[PDB]
Symmetry: D2
């Protein structure tokens, strides 16, 4: 137990009365609306989202990085920190690894995970930066580099990520590369994409029977003129071309200004290529901010599409849910805690939508009542449901408050040496 149980007990007890009052009030209100709050809570306590190992330490921008105290010095410290998020929220049992950042002996990783009560989500490869001892630089590309030897090196790296993942329990590989160009003419758009397609086809061949291969699109950055996998259209072409095991991963902050992201989600589901999500919030570019901190409604609208998918009986639809954020000005553990909470919040509200009524308003083109039907769910304060879900599963009624009360940060600050060079 990273967090003392007596502390979780104390803080939960301190807030029990208020929770009881709020939950019961919400329960009665929902009952009057024909909704069984217990049914919603039962589903909420089972919604899980993977935590990114690279989001447990303080992030930075191209301008600067401002680390806080007790920064994890490696993957093992990071797993320890992830154990806190899971213990308090009970919504993040799995961790997303990034190779070579989290490169370590597979058995050790697995041993630490089991010891902490954590599993492992999709593996993430890294061919957007050079590691020591590389025969080829990824400066001008990786899987789509004009140099065949460079593409071969990148492929091998991805295959290695699969080997690591199989050893620890992962069942998928997410591939995001920075490949693209910063000047018109630098790249032949089509040849670059063909090179990429050939490389991914090879990686596809090393995929176990029950594995998935996710390609993640991104409009720009690091490439500032064109990117090979720039949007969901190119992404669909990739998934369709590679095969059944290949699907598309949607990272919320990777779209052009004003893009209707929830529609992209609906389109990918309709064609069975919605592999998973990378949750975060943003206002300008790929800001990688705490989920829902900027546009909570958009997050709800995305979950509205996910729940509608179930409502329509979409077969074998099991998207992977993951947080992909950077925390530059907050305690990473606290931001990941509240971000996971926000995601469960959007999910819970999505479950409250009266889709029978909505179905009717859409059929009769009653736009005003249709939008009001969604709003009736989104406006509902489901915090009591999230808190009760946590209480029932061993978590904290108020996770960040309990986190601060434990003094975990000061503790790890004393155990961990700050990076000097």
């Amino acid at each position: 137990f990273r967090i003392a149980q007596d502390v979780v007990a104390r803080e939960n007890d301190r807030r029990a009365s208020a929770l009881k009052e709020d939950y019961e009030a919400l329960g009665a209100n929902l009952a009057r609306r024909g909704v069984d709050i217990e049914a919603v809570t039962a589903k909420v306590e089972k919604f899980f989202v993977a935590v990114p190992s690279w989001g447990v330490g303080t992030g930075g921008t191209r301008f600067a990085r401002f680390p806080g105290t007790g920064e994890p010095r490696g993957i093992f410290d990071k797993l320890d920190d992830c154990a806190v998020i899971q213990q308090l929220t009970r919504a993040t049992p799995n961790v997303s690894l990034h190779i070579p950042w989290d490169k370590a002996d597979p058995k050790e990783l697995k041993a630490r995970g089991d010891a902490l009560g954590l599993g492992f989500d999709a593996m993430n490869s890294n061919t957007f930066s050079d590691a020591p001892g590389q025969a080829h630089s990824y400066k001008y590309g990786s899987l789509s580099h004009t140099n065949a030897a460079t593409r071969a090196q990148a492929v091998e790296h991805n295959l290695e990520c699969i080997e690591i993942g199989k050893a620890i329990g992962s069942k998928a590989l997410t591939v995001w590369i920075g490949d693209g160009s910063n000047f018109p003419g630098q790249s032949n758009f089509t040849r670059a994409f063909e090179r990429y397609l050939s490389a991914m086809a090879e990686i596809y061949k090393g995929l176990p029977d029950d594995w998935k291969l996710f390609s993640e699109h991104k409009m720009y950055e690091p490439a500032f003129y064109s990117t090979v996998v720039q949007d969901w259209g190119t992404n669909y072409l990739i998934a369709q071309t590679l095969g059944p095991k290949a699907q598309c991963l949607v990272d919320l902050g990777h779209h052009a200004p004003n893009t209707n992201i929830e529609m992209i989600v609906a389109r990918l589901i309709q064609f069975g290529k919605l592999g998973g999500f990378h949750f975060n919030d943003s206002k300008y570019g790929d800001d990688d901010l705490d989920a829902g901190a900027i546009e909570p409604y958009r997050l709800f609208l995305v979950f509205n599409e996910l729940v509608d998918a179930e409502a329509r009986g979409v077969k074998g639809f099991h998207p992977a849910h993951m947080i992909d954020q950077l925390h530059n000005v907050t305690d990473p553990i606290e931001s990941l805690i509240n971000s996971a909470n926000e995601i469960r919040r959007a999910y819970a509200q999505a479950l409250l939508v009266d889709r029978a009524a909505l179905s009717g308003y859409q059929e009769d083109n009653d736009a005003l009542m249709a939008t009001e039907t969604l709003k009736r769910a989104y406006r509902t304060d489901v915090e009591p449901i999230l808190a009760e879900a946590r209480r029932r599963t061993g978590g904290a009624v108020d996770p960040v408050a309990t986190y601060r009360a434990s003094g975990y940060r000061a503790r790890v600050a004393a155990e961990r040496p700050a990076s000097v060079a």
Copy 2:
């Protein structure tokens, strides 16, 4: 008079009275636990008013098509009758915003009708972005900033006429939004055009009553697709400052570049005393003029957070004009305006719930996470019980759209008005 029968209102309120009582009491207990007196919030909410646009009462259209519904208002008088319904049911829209010459009519009559319906009039709106039949000079290439002196004079004269109409009905401000700009590089000399605009606005200001305000409204684009004279809040500030103390800037939410932090523009204008008022609506792409809060309700809340903070900081003489500027292309105009008015009160109400003392502490300590969570605790609060009770206590409807539909008002005016 009462456009909506009172027995209907009473009936539809009693039908929901029990549920409301339960929700209001529960929220009240929750707010008490948070150190807030729900009664004090309701009191302020029932006092928050936003003006309804005359041009949003009838069905709107795009450059591609217009799909009118039944019972479309024939003119300003029908529109006032319909505005009376919005006010009767929401009790949040006692004033109507007129647009000339769309609403041209005998001022005395308009006032007589407003008085009979229990409606007042907000800022007048001039129109020199379109030509009227028998117009001597066309605004095709501009109006207040047109290169032709006679055309600028005509635009100025039209604005003065708007003021004369406003004085006859009780309006105390004039809002100036023009399409002036260019669609091609080189078409206009940016500086010269702005110089002409400033000179013309100077003449309008000269004719502005001393108990009136002059609001200029910036817009990034449309109808001008390359450059626009009053393109953003920066130019807008230069205008207000140049004209004088009676001139201020009006912020229309959908008139900003993609990803613009609009609440910051609001805060900046308040700091320098030039925030005249708002034109509320929502959008996702351009100046969509959609129902307020229907797309990004948190943004609306964040704008009101700046307004409330201004009061909390102790800003004096700050009374921004609140107006809705929307077009309803695929819904019953009355229903959209009803819920839009409600949404604005919703954001305002939530803004009132913000624990300013706690927020101040987190800001000073650079506790970004708790600062933002402090705003979220207010925003996440479902204040519908408060909005509904305020309505019920002031003669409105617990659920206005439901009551509106139960009344059969639309079918009624549909029979009274030509198809």
Copy 3:
């Protein structure tokens, strides 16, 4: 038939012949030093054509207002007469794109008129984004994707009639752009709406002649302000791919999200054989429908660079349809279309000047700077002498707009046609 007097064209050409000779010869010597035969370029340029929109010769407007100029064309016939002028002077717009029902008229008369004027017809354009007189079902909530079956059937039938009119006049394709979508979250079920659209398009597809094509045109927003069924090239690809071989995607330059790399979309559509054609225009904010290349000339060149690269390395009967889709609210429609057509040929000619061998080398080399400079060397080249000489050799004018004004054509049609009146644009009702 010459809408513009031949002596006027001759006069205006002779007056600028001396200067053109000097510029053409200097550019010829420069290209020669660069290993390029100016005649080869001029020969290709003279053969590049782009269709003119019938709805473009009339003055356009916005939702706020419309400001018609003098001599506004009454109907399709007046518009065809005006299009004949653009073609006579630029020699780059022999085909006109029709829009139904705006230009509905006896096919035999249209066909007869086009021939007399030396004009053909490009793709037909259906209109189910507006209601017409006596229409049984309104398109307020959609057309091909409307929830009401009878409404979708009515829209399908309209499109089939467009195919019928086109078959009679010599058209070989149908372009389908609709406003279908929603203004509020929840109003539409994205998937169901798209399924209905696909099923409706399938019925229209069944009505296509063997040598016809069906072009679906995506647009991010407007008239729908929250979601649009055919919102981008991704959904557009799914459509074309689903319908069949005769279905392809049409790209309108101003229909993309801010900062989108449009030339890449073109390449992707080419790679997968679904590049149906283009709707050329320029913009800075949204679907501004401004004169092509008047705002971002380089972007137009880069789009043509992809086309020429494909045109170079011979591609699958690669013959995308080129059309101009613009609205002119502050200029003489005829003059803007003239210069817009010219700009399109300018970008094309410049793309022709790119040293493909050199470019390929720099790309394989990862020599970004030289690769981009290779494009710039072609783009920086002032090809106006080629464009002018191409027009002069084919019966056109050296300076089209100059000749147009010298002819007094506008004053002439102004006297023959009823005067127009300015007014609103539909933002509100009567």
Copy 4:
């Protein structure tokens, strides 16, 4: 001479003939247009733009940095490379320094600049990153930080930049900070701006009589929710509030999508607050790409406003011009060379605009002819004028070609140790 004169002479002679033909042809064409090419060339020779010291080294993104060979380490190495750009283009006589990146003994800096034939443009302060031993972190801001001591430290830093600048010949200080927030509520917009204005007032008082203080606005990054100096409106408020010596600096890539930047330029000029420019190109955000490599017409349109401003004889108009770019996939020296070249290209074309004709078409609302008047100048290939101006002032006809012919890159690569090589 960083580049052997014999090399410059040989590469000039090699291209002298073609240059003569093109220059004469252009001279004849311009003559027919009532313009004397000699006059344009004379003006172009005198147009200068400052080269960034941080632009000669390879740039990178938050994802990775891919250094090239012969990466300059320290300001002395950087100055040596800047000298090559000036020698070959003759358009970058002055260098922009950034403190503390380029910290060194002022006397020694001046001596080096003099020896290399380089002057110094505006100084640049840095309170958007923490330096070793720093007493107060800038994690939550600097000049607008809530902590008084932190703001004072930031002020002191800027004052030191002024001291260094005065010793080396600089006459201005550019202030760009990352100050802002990543979360709504994190900052009180008004108070933060009040703190900034008060701090800037202190810096303003340390300004010599002949110095200027430039504030640089930016929409976002590093702050992803709000930025204190977010746009030109706030920037104007700052300059007007501070006084006559304070003006606004415009960095092309710092604006919202679709913003009409040339209008902002015109507005600042009209009110005497156009302090200077930070030239670069972009497509998505603050990409910092080579000037004009993405949107050359926009660059021309900006210069059209500058040339018009002089034509009108506006007073208080005397902006500084600087390049602020990052080169992640090209030889930094070649990019700066061609970027300085594009800037002169835009200036040259703006010089060709027939102002009289333009004025007439504007007054008569002939939009088509007015825009065509701009195009006639922009469509003109002024490369002959740029090449001749260089040839006449000791530069290279084709700078990048000569640079490559000289073998300079391999030279410094052999003198400088790479991290790994």
